[PDB]
Design an enzyme around this catalytic site. Structure first.
Site, short mmCIF file in Angstrom:
data_model
loop_
_atom_site.label_atom_id
_atom_site.label_comp_id
_atom_site.label_asym_id
_atom_site.label_seq_id
_atom_site.Cartn_x
_atom_site.Cartn_y
_atom_site.Cartn_z
N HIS A 41 41.68 46.68 38.17
CA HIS A 41 43.00 46.08 38.26
C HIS A 41 43.13 45.07 39.40
O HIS A 41 44.22 44.53 39.61
CB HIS A 41 44.10 47.14 38.34
CG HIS A 41 44.09 47.95 39.60
ND1 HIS A 41 43.83 49.30 39.61
CD2 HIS A 41 44.36 47.60 40.88
CE1 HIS A 41 43.92 49.75 40.85
NE2 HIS A 41 44.23 48.74 41.64
N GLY A 143 47.04 49.45 49.11
CA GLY A 143 45.83 48.85 49.63
C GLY A 143 44.66 49.80 49.74
O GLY A 143 43.57 49.36 50.14
N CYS A 145 43.15 51.08 47.27
CA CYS A 145 42.30 50.84 46.12
C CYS A 145 40.84 50.80 46.56
O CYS A 145 40.51 50.22 47.59
CB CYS A 145 42.64 49.47 45.51
SG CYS A 145 43.78 49.23 44.13
#
Ligand SMILES: *C1=CC(=O)c2c(O)ccc(O)c2C1=O
Lengths: 302, 298
Positions: A41, A143, A145
């Protein structure tokens, strides 16, 4: 002596954290050899996350549209491919700090260490277990991720988790390093709710086994049980016990002398009536038998 | 978002862990620049040792320092309090920006448990008011260090030495000065310990920032509370404490605003706050800011 939630040393994983930027999105990536792994993503925007066509959105991206940064040095993307919910970016330079590693998919109930990162830089490290509902009770902000979960046995790091999203109830969901989500979750903005969670019996039993090695024995009784009856008496939302489970509890059972069914019956009775075991009022279920043996490494008498 | 006992990244400290061997005694050492720091008990074997005589009767080659396979030639040795300093031929290329700091009771740090110079695990813990640590140490974890990371600078603040009879642990700073009235001699007992109120309050702020607010009320003062706190063995609260909780109060409720909520939580707990039924006291105000703001080191 002592018993604490112990995470693995994160140095070997720190040497692989990089920053991946695509358009306006920036997240963390795992730099292993000449490939950078990050959640797919990153190629999305907030408007695309309501119904994203990842294959179509990826066709509209090129190699230099991905900015990979390791510290200040930039890594040139020479190739990109997609595997499930993980994006793989081939780079010109192989990571010199690449350790001996494995990609492993873990089971509900196993524990691992999470290195929370932001912008490719490590923020902290903590231990957590894969809950039976295929979620993790971690600590993640926007953030995070690409933050990875891992285990280190010998000098080989077994990567087992990559963080993706936060569920409405506050728990977190993610995939393995092959991009396959843990549980019925998907990387799209849609009504999703974690299913009902249960307690990991084998971890509670191992944690009770810990307490015995470790001073606390007030909870033991001279009662035994069978497999079915204890699994049936779970009304208290405890995960059922399996034969492989009692085979993993074997080493702890021998070191202490108490059998698994002997402690299973003892666990029953902390359920019927429920002051502090190992310094905690709640029954801890994020300590595997291997974690207890690792910290409570004592002789077994035969 | 969630709140967990978060330890610092241990990569910078792992590159400094070495093995120190003297005779049959082996423990862990801290390799910084061209000096290796390790507990002086490596030079033993003794229940009441005269370390000064035992070290003069020792030379440089009596110390075997190993980093991986690689042997570090000891070209000098000196002693500072309960810490032994071994000068080596090679400076550690992995030496990070570091500082030696003595922390105060109630402050937290990360422990990198090591055995035979190899790092085994990392965990967070606090310096209890009785100058002890409730850690996890096995035989051979001597010399394991505790630290804090600010920016790219590692603040070494603890070196493990011994386990007290109650199962708790004692150690020194990186200058060799013991925390508390303990000595590297065979008998000592930890004094009575208390709960760190300012850490309990900061932990309550963390629950608030994370959604858990069932415990908050709309009203007490300093004197009244430490009257309620002394009986639950909660360490007294000071004005400097509320000034440190200031930033958290502004980001969110004031200290005394929350102090009354704590009084009531002590007075009578029916659920779990942040997933725990017990009041957690191992989170400093900076620890909460670090975990909720997502601070990255380096
Ligand atoms: C391991 C390390 C250490 O420093 C020490 C000490 O200072 C006094 C007594 C003992 O037993 C030890 C030890 O075992």
């Amino acid at each position: 002596s002592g018993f604490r939630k112990m995470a693995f040393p994160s140095g070997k994983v720190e040497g692989c954290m990089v920053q991946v930027t695509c358009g306006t999105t920036t997240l963390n990536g795992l730099w292993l050899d000449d490939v950078v792994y990050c959640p797919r993503h990153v190629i999305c925007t907030s408007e695309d996350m309501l119904n994203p066509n990842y294959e179509d959105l990826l066709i509209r991206k090129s190699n230099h549209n991905f900015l990979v940064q390791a510290g200040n040095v930039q890594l040139r993307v020479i190739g990109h491919s997609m595997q499930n919910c993980v994006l793989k970016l081939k780079v010109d330079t192989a990571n010199p700090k690449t350790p001996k590693y494995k990609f492993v998919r873990i089971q509900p109930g196993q524990t691992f260490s999470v290195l929370a990162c932001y912008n490719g830089s490590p923020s902290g490290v903590y231990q957590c277990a894969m809950r039976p509902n295929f979620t993790i009770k971690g600590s993640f902000l926007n953030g995070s991720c690409g933050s990875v979960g891992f285990n280190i046995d010998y000098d080989c790091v077994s990567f087992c988790y990559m963080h993706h999203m936060e569920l409405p109830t506050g728990v977190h969901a993610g995939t393995d390093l092959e991009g396959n989500f843990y549980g019925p979750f998907v990387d799209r903005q849609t009504a999703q709710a974690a299913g009902t969670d249960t307690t990991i019996t084998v971890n509670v039993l191992a944690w009770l086994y810990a307490a015995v090695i470790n001073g606390d024995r007030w909870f033991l009784n001279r009662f035994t049980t069978t497999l079915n009856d204890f699994n049936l008496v779970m009304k208290y939302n405890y995960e059922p016990l399996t034969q492989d489970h009692v085979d993993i509890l074997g080493p702890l059972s021998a070191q202490t002398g108490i059998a698994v069914l002997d402690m299973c019956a003892s666990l029953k009775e902390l359920l019927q009536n429920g002051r502090t075991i190992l310094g905690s009022a709640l029954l801890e279920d994020e300590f595997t038998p291997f974690d207890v043996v690792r910290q409570c490494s004592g002789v077994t008498f035969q």
